[PDB]
């Protein structure tokens, strides 16, 4: 797998920073997500997983958070300077697996306001870490350390199922989805795709896979979500919000409850 030339400079800067702060504790840095698996759009972020051996000191946490702010920009602000998402995890949480796994920290542009004031999310449980590692074992590039298949072990299918279906419970009310309308719709398409095929695919490809299988009313909602993500039309998602809720409820009712495996 290859790093897109148009992100190499920023990725190299992020790696030099991570190396400085972590240093002796650093086990690996893996690039994953659309930059590697495909689907890198103008607003897409650069997804990075940092594996360390010991927890981050609050000095390391503060420094890494602050200095990442200078290497990252909000999505869409710049074609050259993309949004960074850096997730840090203890190796001991993955080998052997701890369920749910915990993450030491997660930098992201949606936290810029808080990070600009010394407010850092602490370590916490995150079922999504099961999905991250699973996707990394399939499609990732080691910027530092060993390839993923030599560092991590796959999770049991039983736990991958729980991680895939866990977000379905977070989305129940209008406010649970308000603000992330098309992101949630496309993510549901990816969850549906993975549970039915055992594979991971891009947001765009998951929507195309799902559209023919939906009643037209729900296909229209998925189409509007896909259309916005691709930059072809911005919708008024306050108007579409009742239809988004109906789409979420349809997915929760129809997504498989067991693998049709990875
Ligand atoms: C970790 N990736 C970022 C994060 O994504 C999250 C995103 O999570 C969002 C929930 O759906 C939404 O209901 C939730 N909204 C509520 N009313 N509770 C958001 O707060 C939540 N975002 C968050 N905690 N950062 O949906 C999940 C499927 C996700 O992709 C997990 O990995 O947050 C998204 C923005 O919310 C960013 O666009 C992503 O880059
Ligand atoms: N079935 C799934 N397939 C892929 N990702 C999933 C799935 N279910 C949940 N997710 C989560 O959704 C998030 C997607 O991250 P992200 O928004 O960076 O997507 P991406 O593929 O990098 O596309 P983009 O170019 O928009 O960044 C991840 O945190 C991932 O764990
Ligand atoms: Cl329904
Ligand atoms: Mg991404
Ligand atoms: Mg991301």
Short mmCIF file of C-alpha atoms and ligand atoms in Angstrom, two decimals:
data_model
loop_
_atom_site.label_atom_id
_atom_site.label_comp_id
_atom_site.label_asym_id
_atom_site.label_seq_id
_atom_site.Cartn_x
_atom_site.Cartn_y
_atom_site.Cartn_z
CA UNK A 1 0.00 0.00 0.00
CA UNK A 2 1.12 3.54 -0.84
CA UNK A 3 0.92 6.90 0.91
CA UNK A 4 -0.73 9.57 -1.28
CA UNK A 5 2.07 11.96 -2.29
CA UNK A 6 -0.21 14.90 -1.44
CA UNK A 7 -0.23 14.04 2.30
CA UNK A 8 3.36 12.80 2.73
CA UNK A 9 4.70 16.06 4.00
CA UNK A 10 2.02 16.51 6.66
CA UNK A 11 2.14 12.85 7.68
CA UNK A 12 5.92 13.06 8.10
CA UNK A 13 5.50 16.13 10.32
CA UNK A 14 2.92 14.37 12.49
CA UNK A 15 5.26 11.39 12.85
CA UNK A 16 8.22 13.57 13.86
CA UNK A 17 6.03 15.24 16.50
CA UNK A 18 4.65 11.98 17.90
CA UNK A 19 8.17 10.54 18.01
CA UNK A 20 9.45 13.55 19.97
CA UNK A 21 6.77 13.52 22.67
CA UNK A 22 6.40 9.76 23.16
CA UNK A 23 9.97 8.74 22.36
CA UNK A 24 11.03 5.69 24.37
CA UNK A 25 7.41 4.64 24.99
CA UNK A 26 6.55 4.55 21.28
CA UNK A 27 5.76 1.15 19.77
CA UNK A 28 4.28 2.03 16.37
CA UNK A 29 2.49 4.59 14.21
CA UNK A 30 0.02 3.30 11.63
CA UNK A 31 -1.66 5.27 8.86
CA UNK A 32 -5.13 3.96 7.99
CA UNK A 33 -8.51 5.21 6.81
CA UNK A 34 -9.40 6.64 3.43
CA UNK A 35 -5.85 7.88 2.79
CA UNK A 36 -4.87 4.20 2.48
CA UNK A 37 -8.13 2.32 1.86
CA UNK A 38 -9.44 4.78 -0.72
CA UNK A 39 -11.93 7.62 -0.79
CA UNK A 40 -9.70 10.59 0.11
CA UNK A 41 -11.92 13.63 -0.46
CA UNK A 42 -10.99 17.32 -0.09
CA UNK A 43 -12.55 17.36 3.40
CA UNK A 44 -11.14 13.97 4.45
CA UNK A 45 -8.86 13.76 7.48
CA UNK A 46 -5.60 11.85 7.94
CA UNK A 47 -6.19 8.92 10.30
CA UNK A 48 -3.30 7.84 12.55
CA UNK A 49 -3.03 5.21 15.28
CA UNK A 50 -0.25 5.57 17.86
CA UNK A 51 0.61 2.51 19.96
CA UNK A 52 2.60 3.21 23.14
CA UNK A 53 3.89 1.02 25.95
CA UNK A 54 3.17 3.19 29.01
CA UNK A 55 0.41 5.76 29.67
CA UNK A 56 0.94 9.36 28.60
CA UNK A 57 2.08 11.80 31.26
CA UNK A 58 -0.16 14.85 31.49
CA UNK A 59 2.80 16.80 30.10
CA UNK A 60 3.02 14.49 27.07
CA UNK A 61 -0.76 14.71 26.68
CA UNK A 62 -0.76 18.51 26.86
CA UNK A 63 2.20 18.91 24.50
CA UNK A 64 0.92 16.40 21.96
CA UNK A 65 -2.53 18.02 21.98
CA UNK A 66 -1.20 21.57 21.64
CA UNK A 67 1.42 20.86 18.98
CA UNK A 68 -0.98 18.73 16.93
CA UNK A 69 -3.19 21.82 16.78
CA UNK A 70 -0.45 23.55 14.76
CA UNK A 71 -0.06 20.62 12.33
CA UNK A 72 -3.82 20.28 11.72
CA UNK A 73 -6.51 22.49 10.21
CA UNK A 74 -10.30 22.21 10.23
CA UNK A 75 -11.60 20.06 7.37
CA UNK A 76 -11.99 22.04 4.16
CA UNK A 77 -9.91 25.00 5.36
CA UNK A 78 -6.90 24.02 3.23
CA UNK A 79 -6.20 21.62 0.38
CA UNK A 80 -2.64 21.05 1.64
CA UNK A 81 -3.13 21.12 5.44
CA UNK A 82 -5.71 18.47 6.27
CA UNK A 83 -7.50 17.69 9.51
CA UNK A 84 -5.61 15.17 11.63
CA UNK A 85 -7.17 12.43 13.74
CA UNK A 86 -4.60 10.87 16.08
CA UNK A 87 -5.70 8.00 18.33
CA UNK A 88 -3.34 6.76 21.05
CA UNK A 89 -3.72 3.31 22.62
CA UNK A 90 -1.76 1.22 25.11
CA UNK A 91 -0.31 -1.96 23.62
CA UNK A 92 -1.49 -3.79 26.75
CA UNK A 93 -5.12 -3.03 25.80
CA UNK A 94 -4.73 -4.88 22.47
CA UNK A 95 -2.36 -7.79 23.20
CA UNK A 96 -4.05 -9.49 24.94
CA UNK A 97 -7.35 -7.85 24.00
CA UNK A 98 -9.31 -5.94 26.63
CA UNK A 99 -13.03 -5.67 25.88
CA UNK A 100 -14.04 -2.91 25.61
CA UNK A 101 -10.57 -1.52 24.83
CA UNK A 102 -9.44 1.80 26.25
CA UNK A 103 -7.74 4.64 24.38
CA UNK A 104 -5.25 7.00 26.00
CA UNK A 105 -6.32 10.02 23.95
CA UNK A 106 -7.84 11.07 20.64
CA UNK A 107 -6.95 14.31 18.88
CA UNK A 108 -9.43 15.69 16.38
CA UNK A 109 -10.53 19.00 14.89
CA UNK A 110 -13.96 18.68 16.52
CA UNK A 111 -12.09 19.26 19.81
CA UNK A 112 -10.21 22.39 18.70
CA UNK A 113 -12.26 24.69 20.95
CA UNK A 114 -11.63 22.56 24.05
CA UNK A 115 -7.99 21.82 23.19
CA UNK A 116 -7.36 25.56 22.72
CA UNK A 117 -8.13 25.93 26.45
CA UNK A 118 -6.22 23.02 28.01
CA UNK A 119 -9.36 20.86 28.11
CA UNK A 120 -8.23 17.36 27.07
CA UNK A 121 -10.46 14.31 26.92
CA UNK A 122 -8.99 11.69 29.29
CA UNK A 123 -8.44 8.03 28.56
CA UNK A 124 -11.71 6.14 28.27
CA UNK A 125 -13.37 2.99 26.99
CA UNK A 126 -14.02 2.98 23.24
CA UNK A 127 -15.65 0.06 21.43
CA UNK A 128 -14.63 1.73 18.16
CA UNK A 129 -11.03 0.71 18.93
CA UNK A 130 -12.06 -2.83 17.94
CA UNK A 131 -13.09 -1.52 14.52
CA UNK A 132 -9.93 0.58 14.15
CA UNK A 133 -7.58 -2.35 14.77
CA UNK A 134 -9.64 -4.66 12.56
CA UNK A 135 -9.45 -2.15 9.70
CA UNK A 136 -5.75 -1.56 10.38
CA UNK A 137 -5.01 -5.30 10.20
CA UNK A 138 -6.58 -5.27 6.73
CA UNK A 139 -5.43 -1.92 5.29
CA UNK A 140 -2.71 0.17 6.94
CA UNK A 141 0.81 1.50 6.44
CA UNK A 142 3.39 1.39 9.29
CA UNK A 143 5.04 4.80 9.45
CA UNK A 144 6.91 3.61 12.56
CA UNK A 145 7.27 0.08 13.87
CA UNK A 146 6.17 -3.27 12.52
CA UNK A 147 3.34 -3.95 10.10
CA UNK A 148 -0.03 -4.38 11.79
CA UNK A 149 -0.33 -8.11 11.06
CA UNK A 150 2.84 -8.71 13.11
CA UNK A 151 1.83 -6.39 15.99
CA UNK A 152 -1.90 -6.90 16.62
CA UNK A 153 -4.12 -9.95 16.75
CA UNK A 154 -7.66 -9.99 15.31
CA UNK A 155 -10.48 -9.72 17.80
CA UNK A 156 -13.01 -12.54 18.19
CA UNK A 157 -15.92 -12.28 15.78
CA UNK A 158 -18.22 -12.02 18.81
CA UNK A 159 -16.52 -8.80 19.91
CA UNK A 160 -16.34 -7.33 16.40
CA UNK A 161 -20.12 -7.79 16.24
CA UNK A 162 -20.66 -5.92 19.51
CA UNK A 163 -18.40 -3.07 18.35
CA UNK A 164 -20.20 -2.78 15.00
CA UNK A 165 -23.67 -2.71 16.57
CA UNK A 166 -22.78 -0.59 19.62
CA UNK A 167 -23.35 2.81 17.92
CA UNK A 168 -26.87 1.71 16.90
CA UNK A 169 -27.94 2.30 20.51
CA UNK A 170 -26.42 5.79 20.71
CA UNK A 171 -28.73 6.90 17.87
CA UNK A 172 -32.30 6.92 19.19
CA UNK A 173 -33.55 10.52 19.40
CA UNK A 174 -33.49 13.52 17.08
CA UNK A 175 -30.74 15.19 19.12
CA UNK A 176 -28.58 12.05 19.05
CA UNK A 177 -28.20 12.60 15.29
CA UNK A 178 -28.74 16.37 14.88
CA UNK A 179 -25.52 17.87 13.53
CA UNK A 180 -24.08 14.61 12.15
CA UNK A 181 -26.93 13.75 9.78
CA UNK A 182 -25.14 12.56 6.66
CA UNK A 183 -22.18 11.18 8.61
CA UNK A 184 -24.51 8.89 10.58
CA UNK A 185 -26.44 7.83 7.47
CA UNK A 186 -23.24 6.85 5.66
CA UNK A 187 -21.81 5.13 8.74
CA UNK A 188 -24.98 3.03 9.02
CA UNK A 189 -24.40 2.01 5.39
CA UNK A 190 -20.86 0.93 6.28
CA UNK A 191 -22.04 -1.01 9.35
CA UNK A 192 -24.72 -2.69 7.25
CA UNK A 193 -22.11 -3.53 4.60
CA UNK A 194 -19.61 -5.03 7.05
CA UNK A 195 -22.19 -7.14 8.89
CA UNK A 196 -23.54 -8.52 5.60
CA UNK A 197 -20.19 -9.15 3.86
CA UNK A 198 -17.52 -9.24 6.57
CA UNK A 199 -15.57 -6.54 4.71
CA UNK A 200 -14.81 -2.84 5.10
CA UNK A 201 -15.36 -0.33 2.31
CA UNK A 202 -15.48 3.41 1.77
CA UNK A 203 -18.46 5.58 2.65
CA UNK A 204 -19.18 6.16 -1.04
CA UNK A 205 -18.99 2.46 -1.93
CA UNK A 206 -21.11 1.40 1.06
CA UNK A 207 -23.89 3.76 -0.01
CA UNK A 208 -23.79 2.43 -3.58
CA UNK A 209 -23.93 -1.13 -2.22
CA UNK A 210 -26.94 -0.38 -0.01
CA UNK A 211 -29.05 1.87 -2.27
CA UNK A 212 -30.55 -0.92 -4.47
CA UNK A 213 -31.69 -2.84 -1.37
CA UNK A 214 -33.72 -0.03 0.22
CA UNK A 215 -37.30 1.13 -0.30
CA UNK A 216 -37.21 4.28 -2.41
CA UNK A 217 -37.98 6.62 0.50
CA UNK A 218 -34.90 5.44 2.40
CA UNK A 219 -32.78 5.32 -0.77
CA UNK A 220 -33.56 9.02 -1.29
CA UNK A 221 -32.21 9.81 2.18
CA UNK A 222 -29.06 7.77 1.56
CA UNK A 223 -28.63 9.44 -1.83
CA UNK A 224 -28.88 12.91 -0.29
CA UNK A 225 -26.28 11.91 2.31
CA UNK A 226 -23.96 10.49 -0.34
CA UNK A 227 -24.50 13.53 -2.57
CA UNK A 228 -23.47 15.92 0.21
CA UNK A 229 -20.42 13.89 1.24
CA UNK A 230 -19.17 13.93 -2.36
CA UNK A 231 -19.58 17.72 -2.47
CA UNK A 232 -22.32 17.71 -5.11
CA UNK A 233 -25.13 19.32 -3.08
CA UNK A 234 -25.54 20.79 0.41
CA UNK A 235 -28.94 19.96 1.90
CA UNK A 236 -30.97 21.63 4.64
CA UNK A 237 -30.59 18.79 7.12
CA UNK A 238 -33.00 20.45 9.56
CA UNK A 239 -35.71 19.86 6.95
CA UNK A 240 -34.45 16.32 6.31
CA UNK A 241 -34.09 15.46 10.01
CA UNK A 242 -37.40 13.54 10.34
CA UNK A 243 -36.38 11.47 7.31
CA UNK A 244 -32.96 10.86 8.87
CA UNK A 245 -34.61 9.59 12.06
CA UNK A 246 -36.77 7.26 9.97
CA UNK A 247 -33.64 6.06 8.16
CA UNK A 248 -31.87 5.36 11.47
CA UNK A 249 -34.89 3.42 12.73
CA UNK A 250 -35.02 1.42 9.49
CA UNK A 251 -31.35 0.46 9.84
CA UNK A 252 -31.78 -0.53 13.49
CA UNK A 253 -34.67 -2.76 12.39
CA UNK A 254 -33.02 -4.31 9.32
CA UNK A 255 -29.25 -4.44 9.90
CA UNK A 256 -28.20 -8.06 10.59
CA UNK A 257 -27.75 -9.08 14.23
CA UNK A 258 -25.01 -11.57 13.30
CA UNK A 259 -22.43 -11.90 10.55
CA UNK A 260 -23.95 -13.16 7.30
CA UNK A 261 -17.26 -13.15 8.94
CA UNK A 262 -14.29 -10.80 8.65
C1 LIG B 1 -13.70 9.54 15.55
N1 LIG B 1 -14.06 10.17 14.29
C2 LIG B 1 -14.79 11.44 14.45
C3 LIG B 1 -16.04 11.25 15.31
O1 LIG B 1 -16.80 10.25 14.68
C4 LIG B 1 -17.73 9.53 15.53
C5 LIG B 1 -19.17 10.00 15.33
O2 LIG B 1 -19.71 10.19 16.61
C6 LIG B 1 -20.75 11.16 16.75
C7 LIG B 1 -22.06 10.42 16.98
O3 LIG B 1 -22.37 9.61 15.86
C8 LIG B 1 -23.18 11.41 17.23
O4 LIG B 1 -24.40 10.72 17.47
C9 LIG B 1 -22.86 12.29 18.44
N2 LIG B 1 -23.92 13.27 18.66
C10 LIG B 1 -24.70 13.39 19.86
N3 LIG B 1 -25.77 14.14 19.96
N4 LIG B 1 -24.30 12.67 20.99
C11 LIG B 1 -21.52 12.99 18.26
O5 LIG B 1 -21.20 13.73 19.44
C12 LIG B 1 -20.41 11.97 18.00
N5 LIG B 1 -19.12 12.62 17.87
C13 LIG B 1 -18.14 12.53 18.89
N6 LIG B 1 -18.24 12.09 20.12
N7 LIG B 1 -16.87 12.99 18.46
O6 LIG B 1 -19.89 8.93 14.76
C14 LIG B 1 -19.17 7.70 15.00
C15 LIG B 1 -19.65 6.65 14.03
C16 LIG B 1 -17.69 8.11 14.93
O7 LIG B 1 -17.22 8.09 13.58
C17 LIG B 1 -16.77 7.19 15.73
O8 LIG B 1 -15.69 6.89 15.34
O9 LIG B 1 -16.78 12.45 15.42
C18 LIG B 1 -17.23 12.97 14.16
C19 LIG B 1 -18.03 14.21 14.46
O10 LIG B 1 -19.01 13.97 15.45
C20 LIG B 1 -16.03 13.25 13.25
O11 LIG B 1 -16.49 13.70 11.99
C21 LIG B 1 -15.20 11.98 13.08
O12 LIG B 1 -14.03 12.27 12.32
N1 LIG B 2 -18.53 -0.72 9.22
C1 LIG B 2 -17.61 0.25 9.34
N2 LIG B 2 -16.63 0.43 8.42
C2 LIG B 2 -15.72 1.41 8.56
N3 LIG B 2 -15.72 2.28 9.59
C3 LIG B 2 -16.65 2.21 10.58
C4 LIG B 2 -17.68 1.16 10.49
N4 LIG B 2 -18.47 1.30 11.56
C5 LIG B 2 -18.01 2.34 12.28
N5 LIG B 2 -16.93 2.89 11.69
C6 LIG B 2 -16.19 4.05 12.24
O1 LIG B 2 -16.41 5.24 11.49
C7 LIG B 2 -15.24 6.06 11.54
C8 LIG B 2 -14.83 6.48 10.13
O2 LIG B 2 -13.68 7.32 10.18
P1 LIG B 2 -13.48 8.42 9.03
O3 LIG B 2 -14.62 9.41 9.13
O4 LIG B 2 -12.06 8.91 9.06
O5 LIG B 2 -13.77 7.56 7.70
P2 LIG B 2 -12.76 7.48 6.45
O6 LIG B 2 -12.95 6.10 5.86
O7 LIG B 2 -11.37 7.93 6.84
O8 LIG B 2 -13.42 8.51 5.39
P3 LIG B 2 -13.06 10.09 5.32
O9 LIG B 2 -12.32 10.22 4.01
O10 LIG B 2 -14.40 10.77 5.34
O11 LIG B 2 -12.19 10.36 6.52
C9 LIG B 2 -14.15 5.25 12.22
O12 LIG B 2 -13.95 5.72 13.56
C10 LIG B 2 -14.68 3.84 12.21
O13 LIG B 2 -14.25 3.06 13.33
CL1 LIG B 3 -38.54 0.63 10.23
MG1 LIG B 4 -10.72 9.56 7.65
MG1 LIG B 5 -11.22 9.96 11.00
#
